[PDB]
């Protein structure tokens, strides 16, 4: 009862009313400012999956680039509802509940327990293809330009920090590719194998080739341009999340001298090219107007 006068809460600063004013919920995905205004697909698969699923759920939202530190959990692709009061915030919706937040008419088939066979196949997409992507991106030295201009240069613009961040990303990626036994869990002292010298790429590459071929063979049994169903569900989005980024960024035809044809060629050449048409047809339901794909 002591405070005698109350005056008009304090007019938040410029960044915090320019970036986070909003009117519609804002999903936070790895992206570049030239893109985030257009809502064009991200360049990280763990976020492109969620972005594609949401866009399929017919939720109206915008995407802002973020930096993997500003999430209620470690991984990025979380969401925030708009402000209701110029100084009050709703709760941040982590990655897991993005579909629950979206609820139109029927949002069941975007998240339903698949028949057991499909959970067996999801292991390909989630582990084999993921290790292949992680290896080819963070370790193959001919992708240093991509890694920089995608994940490092937008951060700091100070070469002595760029270098440290690049080293951090490479160590944290090598630690993940060396856990899943696709390449190998070589056993060293009580510390993970955090280098490209425990991650023999022949095993990972062959596992990737077989995974793509198995998926291309499965897609041929559905006769409805999807993976058993009528409208693309969770599995098709999880597949797209990788089969696109493996085409836009790693389809560099050089390769004939070193052999080991780069991923995008295998992706478009899986089976008889069914994954390529599948991706080019998911672009046509999610982004009905976007062009520029196929590099």
């Amino acid at each position: 009862y002591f405070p005698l006068r109350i005056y008009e809460p304090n007019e938040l600063p410029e960044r915090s009313q320019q970036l986070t004013s909003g009117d519609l919920p804002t999903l936070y995905v790895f992206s570049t400012d030239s893109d985030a205004r257009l809502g064009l697909p991200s360049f990280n698969p763990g976020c492109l999956k969620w972005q594609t699923l949401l866009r399929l759920a017919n939720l109206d939202f915008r995407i802002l680039p973020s930096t993997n530190h500003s999430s209620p959990t470690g991984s990025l692709p979380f969401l925030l509802p708009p402000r209701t009061s110029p100084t009050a915030s709703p709760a941040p919706i982590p990655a897991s509940g993005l579909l629950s937040f979206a609820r139109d008419l029927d949002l069941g088939h975007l998240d339903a327990d698949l028949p057991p066979r499909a959970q067996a196949y999801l292991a390909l997409i989630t582990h084999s293809l993921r290790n292949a992507w992680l290896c080819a991106l963070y370790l193959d030295p001919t992708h240093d330009a991509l890694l920089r201009r995608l994940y490092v240069d937008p951060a700091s613009s100070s070469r002595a920090v760029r270098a440290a961040l690049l080293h951090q990303l490479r160590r944290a990626a090598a630690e993940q590719v060396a856990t899943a036994s696709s390449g190998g869990g070589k056993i060293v002292s009580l510390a993970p194998v955090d280098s490209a010298d425990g991650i023999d790429e022949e095993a990972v590459y062959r596992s990737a080739r077989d995974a793509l071929d198995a998926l291309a063979s499965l897609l041929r049994e559905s006769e409805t341009a999807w993976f058993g169903t009528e409208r693309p569900g969770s599995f098709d989005a999880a597949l797209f999340s990788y089969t696109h980024l493996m085409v836009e960024y790693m389809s560099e035809e050089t390769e004939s001298a070193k052999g080991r044809v780069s991923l995008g060629r295998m992706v478009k050449e899986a089976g008889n090219g069914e994954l390529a048409e599948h991706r080019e047809r998911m672009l046509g339901v999610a982004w009905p107007e976007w062009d520029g794909y196929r590099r």
């Binding site: 304090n10 600063p13 986070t20 500003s70």
Partner: protein, 409 residues
Amino acid sequence: VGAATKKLARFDIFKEEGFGVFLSEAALDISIRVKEKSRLVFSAGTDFGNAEGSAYTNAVVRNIFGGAETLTVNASTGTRTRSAYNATFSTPINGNPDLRLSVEALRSATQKPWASHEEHLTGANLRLAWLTEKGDTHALAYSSVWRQLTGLAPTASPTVRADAGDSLKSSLTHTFTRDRRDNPMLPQSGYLFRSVSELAGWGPLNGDVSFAKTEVEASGALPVAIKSGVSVGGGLRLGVLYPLPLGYSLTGAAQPSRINDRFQLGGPNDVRGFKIGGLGPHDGVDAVGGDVFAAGSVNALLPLPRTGPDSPLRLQLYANAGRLVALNSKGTDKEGKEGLAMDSAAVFKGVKSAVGKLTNGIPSLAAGVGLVYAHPVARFELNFSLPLVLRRGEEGRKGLQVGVGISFL
């Protein structure tokens, strides 16, 4: 020889107590004595068994060649990552103990509960501290850091979720202090002008922040009438954070400041009667700072009646104040360009309007009563305050306002 001996003691390598000057009336014949301060002092007490690492290393080599000196502090909690460095190296530049240079490299991990997050600093700064014979003290430092923000564990706020990246902040900052107060830990009769400017990344300075931070602090104090330690006090502060373009110009485009760079005005050390980070443009519960600000005080510091001019343990009767605004543009056409690039005219108009808002309305105007204890090293307030006027969302506080430190009002 008084000047000689004082200049000698200013080296900070001779033990303070015990000098001696022995004049032997033989047939001048002056004889000076000194004690040496020390040399390498060490400590390394570690513990283990569980998460405790407590690597606890300390080292001081008081004199390597001339006046040189290397401090090396360390720590490893096993819970926190590390504090692997804090390494200073001081040495007077061949001319006097007055012009002292020091080079420091650090790697620490602070904490900021009022705007919930951490901050990892891993820079290294270069400092050149003069000292004029009149008592004034200039300094000049070049600091280059990393400034990572990695602790947004609770529901923090959409503000810090948007300012949680990295930076460099290579900057060149220059302090200044004129100290004319009798007891620096309990001012009664002197005055104290202290000005700390700073220019961050601009022109030759490269980085990702570009501002110009000015922080003026005046003072005052006076005992009036019936050794009667009345000691009427005073105080004031100011400040501005002015953003600038990124190179060799004044007219250009500036990006507004990050939470790593704004001021925070509140707490037992700056404006008593508030949370450690009260008085802000608060967002939810996290205290986002501002650029312009101000302060105030009016003290009494009366000694315990019927006790006499005893050790300095006195009642503190003080009003107070405080204000802290933010750089809202809201006065030009919409940027059109995507987001954060304000032209020079808009920045100037914004700061003019912000200072205009600083002088509209009574600021906060706390109060209190406290028992000040003037230790030579620190000052202990123990106030009991009563915040009069608040802006909605400034986290008033009303209990016992315990405070310890050096800087106060």
